[PDB]
């Protein structure tokens, strides 16, 4: 538990430790899309997560 | 008009093919993995294949330039180990327009000694220096010296060269008396134990003694607590033994709290744990006398320790030499085996972890094959086999056309052993052998 709680507090990166460990949470900019692209047809919205070795 | 290459050779052993590197800049060919010692009878008439190039016309110097018999067999025994007394198979390859000209030189690399074989030599390398060879023996290594202790306050020593186990070292032929002598009163020499840079020892009266160099010994102020009493020191865990991710440092032993025996662990520079609510009790099957131990790193990066020894004088349904393991110092756990794959009962057994396997040696008491008869080995610590071939006991010679007089095989004597940091096995015999034996499997000295 202490190691998991310590790794949750790192701020340069996020982890994905699977067996009931760590998830990562993302905040989408829905309000900005709703303001800037009103009247458009959305053809694609792409989100990418990428990792270290 | 190229000289592309795929040079290959057929099965030497059944289904065994050897790979050749092709250095086109330096124009030479060789096999990285050397052929076995057996092969000099096989490559006496052998077949080359897959010698594909842009135009197959190729010749070897003979005075004449005769064409290669690519579809026919050849004697290669003249071309082995061509780097000195240099005698390469040198051959010439033509371009399809016959304008561009090249030669390549081929070297068939072959072993001079069998890789996976324990080499003891023809003779024991030294005599046992102890006076009155009946006396109990013990051997241990410290720094760059190997120490041999005898019960009558008597010490002998020999020193090790600078380093690099793969280098052409020779040592052990000379032993010296450590003239200051005088290991402490009432000591029990078979209890001597190593730590990171110090030696520890136990007395009959259950004092603990220690030393920095083995020359002189003193009591210590941290393990000799009142209320407790020590009865055995088993092994020590340290960063020097392996790669422990668990971060364990200390000495493991047995303490008799209020008249009952418990496992306990003395962490670095602090006293034994004596809290009776959170120690653990020693089982009745656990070894009592002449303990041997080893510590090694699991493939997971965690240290582990294993021990064997003599049990109490008599106990029910006991017929085998079970080995006890421990992931730390708090509690030891037996590797009991339900099936027939369990090794026999042995007297004064010793255990080592060596060349990615486990080995045990000892003397048997079945009255039809008494004495040291063979080593016993395990790949995974839970199944044990007798080695009927290479890796024999010392003094077991191959046919030069035999048993050496000072061999262990069939003897029933006192002894001791250790493995040093060049992976030499050291075996020391008491009354009835009177000699020092030294050996290592050849595969550990190779540069490969």
């Amino acid at each position: 538990p202490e190691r998991i709680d310590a790794l949750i507090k790192e701020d340069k990166n996020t982890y994905l430790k699977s067996p009931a460990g760590i998830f990562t949470e993302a905040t989408l900019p829905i309000s900005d899309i709703q303001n800037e692209l009103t009247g458009d047809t959305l053809n694609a919205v792409k989100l990418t997560f990428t990792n270290y070795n | 008009d190229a000289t592309i290459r795929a040079f290959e050779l057929d099965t030497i052993g059944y289904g065994v093919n050897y790979k050749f590197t092709i250095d086109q800049v330096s124009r030479l060919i060789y096999n990285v993995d050397s052929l076995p010692v057996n092969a000099d009878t096989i490559i006496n008439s052998i077949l080359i294949k897959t010698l594909t190039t842009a135009s197959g016309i190729v010749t070897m110097k003979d005075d004449q330039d005769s064409i290669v018999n690519i579809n026919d067999s050849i004697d290669l025994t003249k071309y082995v180990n061509a780097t000195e007394k240099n005698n390469f198979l040198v051959l010439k390859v033509w371009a399809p327009n016959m304008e561009v000209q090249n030669e390549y030189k081929v070297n068939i690399r072959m072993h001079t000694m069998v890789p996976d074989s324990l080499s003891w030599g023809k003779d024991p390398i030294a005599n046992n220096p102890v006076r009155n060879t009946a006396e109990k023996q013990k051997v241990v290594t410290l720094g760059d010296k190997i120490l041999l202790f005898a019960q009558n306050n008597e010490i002998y020593s020999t020193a090790i060269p600078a380093g690099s186990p793969t280098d052409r070292l020779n040592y052990g032929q000379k032993w010296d008396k450590e003239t200051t002598g005088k290991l402490p009163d009432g000591a029990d020499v078979t209890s001597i134990i190593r730590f990171v840079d110090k030696l520890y020892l136990l007395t009959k009266n259950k004092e603990v003694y220690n030393s920095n160099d083995g020359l002189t010994w003193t009591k210590d102020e941290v393990l000799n607590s009142d209320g407790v009493s020590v009865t055995n020191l088993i092994t020590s865990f340290s960063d020097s033994d392996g790669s422990n991710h668990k971060k364990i440092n200390g000495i493991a032993g047995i303490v008799e709290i209020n008249g009952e025996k418990y496992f306990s662990f003395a962490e670095k520079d602090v006293t034994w744990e004596k809290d009776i609510d959170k120690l653990t009790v020693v089982p009745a099957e656990f070894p009592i006398n002449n303990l041997s131990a080893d510590v090694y790193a699991t493939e997971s990066g965690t240290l582990n320790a294993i021990v064997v020894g003599n049990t109490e004088d008599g106990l029910d349904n006991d017929t085998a030499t079970v080995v006890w393991a421990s992931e730390d110092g708090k509690a030891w756990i037996p590797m009991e085996i339900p099936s027939n794959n369990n090794c026999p009962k042995l007297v004064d057994p010793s255990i080592i972890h060596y060349n990615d396997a486990f080995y045990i040696c000892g003397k048997e008491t079945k009255d039809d094959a008494k004495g040291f008869q063979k080593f016993y080995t395990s790949p995974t610590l839970l199944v044990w086999k007798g080695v009927d071939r290479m890796f024999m006991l010392p003094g077991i010679l191959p046919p030069v056309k035999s048993l050496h007089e000072s061999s262990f095989k069939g003897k029933e004597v006192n002894y001791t052993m250790v493995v040093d940091r060049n992976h030499y096995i050291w075996m020391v015999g008491g009354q009835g052998i009177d000699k020092i034996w030294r050996g290592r499997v050849n595969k550990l000295g190779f540069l490969i």
Partner: protein, 169 residues
């Protein structure tokens, strides 16, 4: 766009070939003789050497394995394949839109003749940009993604080379 592809690609190679022969400082170019056709040359450009070499002196052989960061592009600079897509390989990369590059294993005898010639003369940790003719690339019809008769330009970083994959991977 892709008109008269062969002639212009060959003209690019000829431009490099005569620049090495007439320009000051060789125009930055250097060259190696090709063992599958003596008298022909492959042209390359030296670049920033690495700082984490696995201290493996010597050069790779023809029938042994190689670990690299690499990127392949055509004459117009467009992407073909590789481990990385920017102007440098990515390790501990600060930009969260690009991941750290993987390393790939190749056999020197299992690649195009340009690679098979240039890889036998690098030392671990060299970075070279190499310019190979269509005679020694895939050539003729070309593979998927190649318009045929194409001169590829590769950016190579040699990390490691060994006799087997198991001691390298």
């Amino acid at each position: 766009k892709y008109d008269n592809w062969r002639a212009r690609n060959e003209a690019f190679i000829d431009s490099l070939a005569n620049v090495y022969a007439t320009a000051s400082g060789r125009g930055g170019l250097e060259r190696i003789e090709m063992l599958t056709a003596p008298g022909n040359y492959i042209y390359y450009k030296e670049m920033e050497p690495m700082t984490d070499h696995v201290v493996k002196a010597g050069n790779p052989k023809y029938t042994d394995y190689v670990k690299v960061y690499y990127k392949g592009t055509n004459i117009l600079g467009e992407y073909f394949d590789g481990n990385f897509k920017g102007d440098n390989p990515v390790v501990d990369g600060k930009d969260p839109s690009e991941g750290d590059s993987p390393t790939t294993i190749f056999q020197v005898s299992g690649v195009i003749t340009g690679w098979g010639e240039v890889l036998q003369r690098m030392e671990v940790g060299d970075r070279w940009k190499v310019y190979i003719p269509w005679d020694y690339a895939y050539g003729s019809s070309g593979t998927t993604g190649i318009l045929g008769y194409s001169a590829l330009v590769f950016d190579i970083t040699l990390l490691d080379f060994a006799n087997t994959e198991a001691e390298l991977k």
